[PDB]
Design an enzyme around this catalytic site. Structure first.
Site, PDB file in Angstrom:
ATOM      1  N   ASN B  74      42.592  46.420  49.170  1.00  0.00           N
ATOM      2  CA  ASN B  74      41.877  47.531  48.559  1.00  0.00           C
ATOM      3  C   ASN B  74      41.109  48.241  49.659  1.00  0.00           C
ATOM      4  O   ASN B  74      39.901  48.034  49.825  1.00  0.00           O
ATOM      5  CB  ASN B  74      40.917  47.043  47.475  1.00  0.00           C
ATOM      6  CG  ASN B  74      41.626  46.708  46.176  1.00  0.00           C
ATOM      7  OD1 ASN B  74      42.690  47.247  45.881  1.00  0.00           O
ATOM      8  ND2 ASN B  74      41.034  45.819  45.390  1.00  0.00           N
ATOM      9  N   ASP B 217      45.320  46.356  39.448  1.00  0.00           N
ATOM     10  CA  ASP B 217      44.462  45.256  39.045  1.00  0.00           C
ATOM     11  C   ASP B 217      44.173  44.330  40.212  1.00  0.00           C
ATOM     12  O   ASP B 217      43.379  43.398  40.076  1.00  0.00           O
ATOM     13  CB  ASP B 217      45.100  44.472  37.898  1.00  0.00           C
ATOM     14  CG  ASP B 217      44.876  45.129  36.542  1.00  0.00           C
ATOM     15  OD1 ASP B 217      43.701  45.399  36.195  1.00  0.00           O
ATOM     16  OD2 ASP B 217      45.870  45.365  35.816  1.00  0.00           O
ATOM     17  N   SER B 218      44.817  44.576  41.355  1.00  0.00           N
ATOM     18  CA  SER B 218      44.591  43.750  42.544  1.00  0.00           C
ATOM     19  C   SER B 218      43.116  43.787  42.914  1.00  0.00           C
ATOM     20  O   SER B 218      42.511  44.853  42.976  1.00  0.00           O
ATOM     21  CB  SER B 218      45.426  44.233  43.735  1.00  0.00           C
ATOM     22  OG  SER B 218      46.808  44.003  43.528  1.00  0.00           O
ATOM     23  N   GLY B 219      42.537  42.619  43.157  1.00  0.00           N
ATOM     24  CA  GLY B 219      41.132  42.536  43.499  1.00  0.00           C
ATOM     25  C   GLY B 219      40.265  42.238  42.296  1.00  0.00           C
ATOM     26  O   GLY B 219      39.202  41.628  42.438  1.00  0.00           O
TER      27      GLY B 219
END
Lengths: 920, 920
Positions: B74, B217-219
Site C-alpha cells: 500500500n 482489501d490488502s492491508g
C-alpha cells in the site's frame, strides 16, 4: 295622661304609636332616664301589645268586627278611625260611623254601673283585628301578676308631665294626640271595677313607664296580658284612676240582637233567594226547608239617618247620636257544607248588617241587582263566588281568612277594602264592553291578598297599600303604575304563579307642574316617588314566581326611592331617571308640642327622625340592568345581591362616604313626601351606625357606562369593562374580586382596597392612586398601567405593556419585608422606586426587564441575603427584553449607593446596555 | 469484500460501522436471511468489537497512540482518519499524517515477509483507543476456538455479493465504503501467516456473516477474540484469503527507536530545562543528575517535509511518502514521584515526537516560549500544570487518564482535541487583557473531560463534541451557545460542582439568511438545531451538581431538538420558539449503492432510516418552565419526569397520535441537518413500536397557556389551571391524577381516560366528550360542566352548578349495572338520560336535585330492587333544591313507561312541583 318629665317624652309617644323600639311583638325594651340611667326593661313577660285596635282619638277600642267599647258619658263622638298617625294620603283612612251606641241600662239583670256603652259601626273594620275581652267581673281576679304579668293603657286626654317635685306642666289639651305606657300599680278592686295608681316618678310593678289618665281619657282602654293564653285582652275602660271592667256577657246580648238569622240546609247545596224594600223589610226564600220563607230586616229609608239614642242616666245626656236607618239592618249568617247559592232577586241595602259565609257559595243577581252592607266575612278554606256589583261611593269591607272571588258584570262603581284573606279579581265585561272590579282598591292590616285573574280590572292609580298593606299577587299579569300608593313595609307586590312571569312598570308622575283648584294632591306632582314595601315573595312557604321590575320615567330628573326590599326571581331594569336603594329612618311618634314645651323637652317640633337610628335593608334580584339614568345604593343597605349590567351612558354608585356629603333620600311618614338632598356625614355615632354594604354579585360595564364603589361598601364579585366604560373603587371601599378591562375602558383604585387581580388588553387603562396593592396585574399590547402615590407588591412574574410611575414604589418580591421578574414590553416612564431582593452568593435576584422605550428617573433599592459570593461576577438588575441596549433617557440610582455581601462591595453601573451590580 | 446476496447487505454495512444492532459490546445478534429464516446468532461468545480503531479507508488499524499497521505494498496513502461515516461538520474529522512508513526489511533477525509496515503518525490519535496485538507468530496458535471463539475482518476493497449459484455482482469499486463480518473458517496456518476461506453462502464456525477480501482489501485488519484475556486483539493483516500475522517484536523495535529518552530524578522534585533549534537539534538540562545535559532530536526544518521512504522490495516500489522533517523528533518520557518541573528556554517543535508525563509536573516558559508535537499523555492520577501556549493552525492531542491543567498566558492560537482524561481550562489574561485557552476545543472518544476553572476561556462557537463526545464540566460556570456542535449521544454537558450552580443558554442560529461565498456551513443558517447528547450527569459515582438549561431563540420559528437525554438537578426554561423532546431513529450504515444495485437489494439510495426502529429516551428535570413558545414531547420518549409550568401564551403537547399526522423532528447522521415535518403514523409495525410516554409530574397552566396530552401518552400527575388556560386530554390518552380548574380556565376530555377527579370554581368549565368517566366532579358557583356523547357514572354524592347535557347519560349510582344524589345548584339544560337505582320497598332511591333554572328533555331509567312495598307511597326521583317548584320547561320521560315492584305498578308524574313514581 300624666308622664314623668324625668324620662324622655318620646318613650310615651313611641309606646302609643308602636314606634321606636315599641313595634308590635317586641320585647325587653330598655328604658333610660334623662340621666342615661336604666329605669327598667319593658315587655319582658309579653310581646308588645298591638295598639292598632285603639281608635286614633283614644276614646275607644275594637272588640269585634263592627263593635267598639267606651264610656256612655262620651256623648259627642259619632265615628272612629284606625291606623297610623299622620296625613299621608296613601293611607286612605276610613271613617267608621256609630249607628247604635248601646248605652248600658242598669237593672235587675244588668247589675253594673251605666257609664258604659258598646257602639255598633256601620262597616266591618278591616285595618285591625279586634281584641278579645276579659270575662271575669271580679276585679281581684287580675291582681295575680304571674297569670297577668303585663298591663298597659293608652289615651288622648289632657297631657301633663310631672317633675321630681311632682309638679305638673300641661303640655297639650285633650284629644290632640295619644300617649301610653304600662299602667300604675294595682290599688284595689271589686265587682265590676279596678283602681290603678301610684307615683309616676317611679318604676312600677308593670314596668318603667307608668301612665295615669286625666280629663279626656275617660273611655280610653286598659289592657291586660293573660300569660296562660298568651293574649293581650282588653280589661277595662277608664272612668290614680278607676276602671270599669269590660262586660263580655252584655256584649254578647248586643251581638246576638244584631246577628240572629242563620241560613242552613242540612243536606248541602242550599239555595236561598233574597229580596227587600226601602222600608227596611226583607225576605229570604229557602228552596227547601221549612219554613220556606224567612223575614229579615234591612236599612230602613223611612227612618232618620241621625237620631238621639236611648239615654239611661240623666248625667250622660247629650247628643248621643245614632242611625236608626242603618242600625235597622241585621247581619246574616250562611253556612253550607257543599256548594250553597244566594240569589239576589232585588237590590239589597243591609245598612249596618253584614254577611258571614261558612263554606263555599255562589252569589248571583237575577239581573243587575246590587249589594250594600257592613261587609263580607268569608271563613277559612271557604270560597265565595261574588257576582253582584256594588254601589257608587260605597266601600265594601272584606274580612275573614276565606276567599272572595269577584266576578260581577260591567263597571262596578263601589270600592273595596281588603283586610283579611283573599279577593280574586275577575270582573266580566258587560254587553257594552265595560269592565271594572272596583273604583278603588286598598289592602290593609297585612293579612289580605288581592289576586289578579284578568287584565284591566282596575285603575292602577286607584289601588293603594294602606296601613300595614298586604299582598298584591299579579298571578302572571302585568301592570304599569305612575306612582304606587303605599304607606309602609306591609306593602307587597308578588307573583305566586308558578308558570307565568309578571312585570311591574313604574313610570313616575305624569307632570311636575302644579294644577290649580283647591284639592291638590302634592304626591302626584313631585319629581320623587317612593315605595316602602316589597317586590317579590319573602315567605318560604309561598311561591316566589318570576317577577320583573321596570323603572321607566319620562325625564332624567325623576327619582324612585325603594326603602323596603326586593326578593326577585327576575330583574330590575332602569331606563332613565334616578333609582335609590336605601334603608330608612326608624319611625318615631310625631312631636305635637308647641315651641315652649318642645324647647323644655329638648326636641324639634314636628317629625321625629334620628340620623343614627335607621332600619337596615336587603335587596335581591337576578340582574340589575341599568340601561340608562342613574342607580344609587345608599345608606343602611346591609346587602344587595344580584349581577349588574350598566350600559349606554348609565351610571351605578354604591356606598356613602364618611366625612363627605352624600345625597340621602327619605320619605316622610307624616306627609308621604319624598325628599332627596345632600347631607353631611360627620357624626361619629351616625357613621358607626351605618353598615358596609355587601354587594353580592358581579358588575359589567359597557359603552360609556360608569360605576363607583366607595366608602361604606364592599364589592363581593368581579368587574368587567368594555368600550369606553369607567370603574372607580375609592374612599376606602373594598373589593373581593377581579377587574377585567378591554377596549378603551378605564379602572381606578383611589385610596381603596382591591383584593384581586387586574387584566387589561387593547387600549384599556388601570390607575392605582394613593393605595397599596399586593396582587397580580397583567397588561398586553396597547394597555397602560399608572401608579400615583401608590405602592405595589408584585406576587409573581408579571407582564405589562406601558407603565407610568409617579411618586410610587414597586416591590418586585413579597419577600422584601423564589425570584420575580417584571417585564415592561411597552414604554415605562415617569419616576419612582423599584425594590429588589437578591442573593449575590448565587448571583440571582428579582429582575426588571425593559424595552428601548423605557425612560425616566428611578431609585433602586436592594435587599440581599445570605453568604459572600465564592466568585466574582456581575448581577444584572435591569435588563433589556432582547439584545438592544437600554435608552440613555433611562436613569437609575442605587439606594445607599452600594450593596454589601460580606467583604464584597457592589455598586450600580450601566455596563453593556444593562444596569448591573458590580465589584470594583 | 464478498458478501452473501442471500442476506441483507445492511448486516454487513451495520457490522462495519458498529450500527444497527452491532453497537460496541452488543451480544447475541440474530441474523436472518432474505427468507426471514435464522442463519445464526452473532457475537454469542464475545462483546461486539469496537471498529473505531480501523481507519475510515479500511487499509489500516491503530496499534499504538501514533502507530498503525498495514501492508508495505500500500504505497500510495499518506494519511488516515477515524470516527464515524458521513459529512456532519460537527465531527471535525482529523487527518493524521504518516511521517515514517517503517517498511519491514527481511533479514537474519527479521525472518518474515516484507509486505508489512508500521507507519508512524504525526499526532497522537484521540478518537479511539489503540488495539493490542497478538504476540505469537505461529498461525496454528489461533485455531483453538475455545481460547479464540470469535474472529472478524473489515475492509473497503472491491465490493461483491454472491448468489446461491456463487455468481458475483460487483456493486462498488475499491475504497468507496467499508464492509465487514466474521472471517471465514480456519484453513491452514504456519509461521507468520494464516489462511481463512470457505463458502460465503454458508454460516461459518465464526458466525453467520463470513466475509472474504478482494482487490483493495490488502492491508485491511483481521481481529481475533482472546476469551481468556477477554480482549479483541488484532491478529493479522490481509495480504479465501491469506493473512500476515501481526509482528509485536518488530513493532517494539520501531517504538523504542522513537521513544528512548527517559527523564527521571531519583529524589523527586526534578527540574529539567529544554531548548532546541530549527536544525532539529535540542537539549535537556537536568538540574542535578549526571550527566547534567541530554541531547535530544526535534523537528528538523532543513529536511524536506516530504520524501521517499526506504523501499526493501522492488515489487513494493512507488511513492512511499514520509516526512523526514517531522519524523526526526523523538518522544520524551518524564517521570517524577513528587513535583517535577520542565522549563521551556526556547520554543520547541518536537515534530512527530510527543510527551508522556508520569507524576505531577509544572511546565513553564521563561517567557512566551511555545510547544508543538505529537501530543501529551498524562498518567492516571497525575496532574500536569501546563503554562505553555500553542501554535496557530496546530492541534494539540491530549490523551492518558491524567489531568492537563492549562494555565498559559494570553491568547493561545493553537487548538485542542481531548481524547482521554481531564483538561482544566484556566488561561490567564496577558498584560493587554487577552485571554483564550484554545482557538478550538473538541471532546472525542467519550473518555475525556473539559473542566472550566474560569470564564471567557474559549469561543463557544468553536467548541465541539466530536465522535463519541465526552464531558464538558461547567464546574459552576455559565455558557451561552448559538448552536452546540455535537455528533452523537456521547456529548455530555454536566456540572460536577457541589457548591455552585451552572446555566447553559441556547439561543439558536443568529440568522437564517444564507451568506455568500464558497464555504457556507448550512448548519449555521437553519431554523432547526439539535443536540444529540446529555444535560446532567448520569454516572451515579460522579456528582450531579445543579444545572439549568434555557432555550431562548430570537424568533417564534426556531426549533431545538433534544434527542439524547437530561438528568437535571435544575430546570429547563423555554422563552420562545419550538422545543422537541424526542427519541431518534436507530443508526444504520449509509447506502452508497447506485440505482441498479439498490433496486436489486430493495433499499433506498443514501441514508438508511427505519420508521419502526427507533431508540427510546428518558428526560428528567426538576421543573419545565415553558414561559413562551411551544414545547413538544414526541415519539419514542419512554418517560419525561418533572413538574410543568406553562404560562403566558405558551403551549405544551405530549404524545403522538396513531392514524394521524404528527410533526416529527429528526437529525441526519450523514449531514448533521435537522428536519421537522408532518408524517403519517399509519403502519401497524411503527405504531406498535412506539411506547406510551409516561409523563411523571404535575402540570400547571396559567394566563393563556394551553396543554395537550394525546395519543401514546399517560399523565402520571395532576393538572391545575388558572386565568384563561386550557387543557385537553384526547385521542385515547390516559391520566392518573386530578384536574383542578379556577378562574376562567377550561378542561376537556375528548375520547380519553381521566382516572381521577375534577374540581371547578369561579367561571371554570369542564367538558367531557365522546368519553366514559367514573369519578367525582365538583363544581360550585359560576362553573359549567358539559357532556357530549358521553357517559358518566357518579361514585358518590355530587354538587355542580351548571350542567349541560347533549346525547349523554349520567348513571347516578355505580350499582346500576347506598344511594346517591346529584345536586345541580345552577342551570341544568340540554337533553340526555339519567339512570336511577331504587328500592321501592323502603321508598329510597338515587336523587336528582334541581333548581328553578332546570330545563330540557330527559329520559329517566330506573332499576329497582327487591321486595314489593308493604305500603303505598310516592317515590320522589327529581326534586327541587328547596320548596319552589321545578320549571315547566323541564321535561322527563320514564323508560319502559313504568316500574314494577311485584304486583305494584308505578308510573312517572309531576306532582306538587316534583317528579315522582306513583301508583294509580
Amino acid at each position: 295622661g300624666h308622664t314623668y318629665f324625668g324620662i324622655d317624652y318620646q318613650y310615651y309617644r313611641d309606646f302609643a304609636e308602636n314606634k321606636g323600639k315599641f313595634t308590635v311583638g317586641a320585647q325587653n325594651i330598655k328604658v333610660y332616664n334623662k340621666q342615661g340611667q336604666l329605669v327598667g326593661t319593658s315587655m319582658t313577660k309579653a310581646p308588645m301589645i298591638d295598639f292598632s285596635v285603639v281608635s286614633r282619638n283614644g276614646v275607644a277600642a275594637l272588640v269585634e268586627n263592627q263593635y267598639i267599647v267606651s264610656v256612655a258619658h262620651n256623648v259627642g263622638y259619632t265615628d272612629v278611625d284606625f291606623g297610623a298617625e299622620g296625613n299621608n294620603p296613601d293611607q286612605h283612612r276610613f271613617t267608621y260611623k256609630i249607628v247604635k251606641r248601646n248605652n248600658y241600662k242598669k237593672d235587675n239583670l244588668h247589675p253594673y254601673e251605666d257609664d258604659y256603652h258598646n257602639p255598633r259601626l256601620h262597616k266591618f273594620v278591616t285595618e285591625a283585628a279586634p281584641i278579645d275581652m276579659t270575662s271575669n267581673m271580679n276585679g281581684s281576679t287580675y291582681s295575680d301578676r304571674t297569670k297577668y304579668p303585663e298591663r298597659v293603657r293608652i289615651g288622648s286626654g289632657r297631657q301633663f308631665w310631672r317633675n321630681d317635685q311632682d309638679k305638673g306642666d300641661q303640655v297639650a289639651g285633650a284629644y290632640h294626640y295619644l300617649t301610653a305606657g304600662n299602667t300604675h300599680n294595682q290599688r284595689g278592686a271589686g265587682n265590676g271595677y279596678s283602681y290603678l295608681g301610684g307615683d309616676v316618678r317611679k318604676a312600677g310593678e308593670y314596668g318603667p313607664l307608668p301612665i295615669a289618665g286625666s280629663k279626656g281619657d275617660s273611655g280610653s282602654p286598659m289592657f291586660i296580658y293573660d300569660a296562660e293564653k298568651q293574649k293581650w285582652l282588653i280589661n277595662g275602660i277608664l272612668r290614680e284612676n278607676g276602671f270599669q271592667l269590660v262586660r263580655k256577657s252584655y256584649f254578647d246580648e248586643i251581638f246576638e240582637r244584631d246577628l240572629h238569622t242563620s241560613l242552613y240546609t242540612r243536606a248541602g247545596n242550599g239555595v236561598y233567594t233574597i229580596s227587600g224594600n226601602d222600608n227596611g223589610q226583607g225576605s229570604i226564600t229557602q228552596k227547601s226547608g221549612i219554613p220556606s220563607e224567612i223575614k229579615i230586616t234591612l236599612a230602613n229609608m223611612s227612618l232618620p239617618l241621625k237620631e238621639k239614642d236611648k239615654v239611661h242616666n240623666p248625667r250622660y245626656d247629650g247628643p248621643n247620636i245614632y242611625s236608626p236607618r242603618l242600625n235597622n239592618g241585621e247581619t246574616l249568617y250562611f253556612m253550607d257544607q257543599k256548594q250553597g247559592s244566594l240569589i239576589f232577586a232585588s237590590d239589597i241595602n243591609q245598612g249596618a248588617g253584614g254577611l258571614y259565609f261558612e263554606g263555599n257559595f255562589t252569589v248571583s243577581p237575577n239581573s243587575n241587582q246590587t249589594w250594600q252592607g257592613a261587609g263580607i266575612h268569608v271563613s277559612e278554606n271557604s270560597t265565595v263566588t261574588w257576582k253582584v256589583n256594588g254601589v257608587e261611593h260605597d266601600r265594601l269591607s272584606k274580612i275573614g281568612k276565606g276567599t272572595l272571588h269577584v266576578q260581577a258584570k260591567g263597571e262596578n262603581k263601589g270600592s273595596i277594602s281588603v283586610g283579611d284573606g283573599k279577593v280574586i279579581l275577575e270582573q266580566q265585561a258587560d254587553d257594552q264592553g265595560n269592565k271594572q272590579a272596583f273604583s278603588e282598591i286598598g289592602l290593609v292590616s297585612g293579612r289580605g291578598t288581592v289576586q289578579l285573574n284578568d287584565d284591566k280590572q282596575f285603575d292602577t292609580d286607584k289601588f293603594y297599600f294602606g296601613f300595614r298593606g298586604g299582598r298584591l299577587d299579579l298571578n302572571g299579569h302585568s301592570l304599569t303604575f305612575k306612582r304606587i300608593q303605599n304607606t309602609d313595609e306591609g306593602a307587597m307586590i308578588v307573583n305566586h304563579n308558578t308558570t307565568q312571569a309578571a312585570n311591574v312598570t313604574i313610570t313616575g308622575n305624569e307632570s311636575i307642574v302644579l294644577p290649580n283648584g283647591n284639592n291638590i294632591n302634592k304626591l302626584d306632582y313631585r319629581k320623587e316617588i317612593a315605595y316602602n314595601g316589597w317586590f317579590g315573595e319573602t315567605d318560604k312557604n309561598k311561591h316566589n314566581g318570576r317577577l320583573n321590575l321596570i323603572y321607566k320615567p319620562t325625564t332624567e330628573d325623576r327619582t324612585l326611592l325603594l326603602s323596603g326590599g326586593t326578593n326577585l326571581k327576575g330583574d330590575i331594569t332602569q331606563t332613565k331617571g334616578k333609582l335609590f336603594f336605601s334603608g330608612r329612618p326608624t319611625p318615631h311618634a310625631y312631636n305635637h308640642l308647641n315651641k315652649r314645651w318642645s324647647e323644655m323637652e329638648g326636641i324639634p317640633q314636628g317629625e321625629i327622625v334620628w340620623d343614627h337610628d335607621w332600619i337596615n335593608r336587603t335587596f335581591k334580584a337576578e340582574n340589575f340592568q341599568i340601561k340608562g339614568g342613574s342607580a344609587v345604593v345608599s345608606r343602611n343597605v346591609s346587602s344587595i345581591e344580584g349581577n349588574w349590567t350598566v350600559s349606554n351612558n348609565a351610571n351605578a354608585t354604591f356606598g356613602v362616604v364618611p366625612n363627605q356629603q352624600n345625597t340621602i333620600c327619605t320619605r316622610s311618614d307624616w306627609t308621604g313626601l319624598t325628599t332627596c338632598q345632600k347631607v353631611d356625614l360627620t357624626d361619629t355615632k351616625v357613621i358607626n351606625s351605618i353598615p358596609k354594604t355587601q354587594i353580592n354579585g358581579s358588575i359589567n360595564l359597557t359603552d360609556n357606562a360608569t360605576a363607583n364603589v366607595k366608602g361604606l361598601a364592599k364589592l363581593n364579585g368581579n368587574v368587567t369593562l368594555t368600550n369606553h366604560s369607567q370603574f372607580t373603587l375609592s374612599n376606602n371601599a373594598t373589593q373581593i374580586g377581579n377587574i377585567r378591562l378591554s377596549d378603551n375602558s378605564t379602572a381606578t383604585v383611589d385610596n381603596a382596597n382591591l383584593n384581586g387581580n387586574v387584566h387589561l388588553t387593547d387600549s384599556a387603562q388601570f390607575s392605582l392612586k394613593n393605595s397599596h396593592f399586593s396582587h397580580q396585574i397583567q397588561g398586553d399590547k396597547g394597555t397602560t398601567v399608572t401608579l400615583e402615590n401608590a405602592t405595589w407588591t408584585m406576587p409573581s412574574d408579571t407582564t405589562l405593556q406601558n407603565l407610568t410611575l409617579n411618586n410610587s414604589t414597586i416591590t418586585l418580591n413579597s419577600a422584601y419585608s423564589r425570584f420575580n421578574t417584571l417585564t415592561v414590553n411597552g414604554k415605562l416612564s415617569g419616576q419612582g422606586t423599584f425594590q429588589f431582593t437578591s442573593s449575590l452568593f448565587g448571583y440571582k435576584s428579582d429582575k426588571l426587564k425593559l424595552s428601548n422605550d423605557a425612560e425616566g428617573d428611578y431609585i433602586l433599592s436592594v435587599r440581599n441575603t445570605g453568604k459572600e459570593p465564592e466568585t466574582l461576577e456581575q448581577l444584572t438588575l435591569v435588563e433589556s427584553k432582547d439584545n438592544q441596549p437600554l435608552s440613555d433617557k433611562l436613569k437609575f440610582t442605587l439606594e445607599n449607593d452600594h450593596v454589601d455581601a460580606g467583604a464584597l462591595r457592589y455598586k450600580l453601573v450601566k455596563n453593556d446596555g444593562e444596569f448591573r451590580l458590580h465589584n470594583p
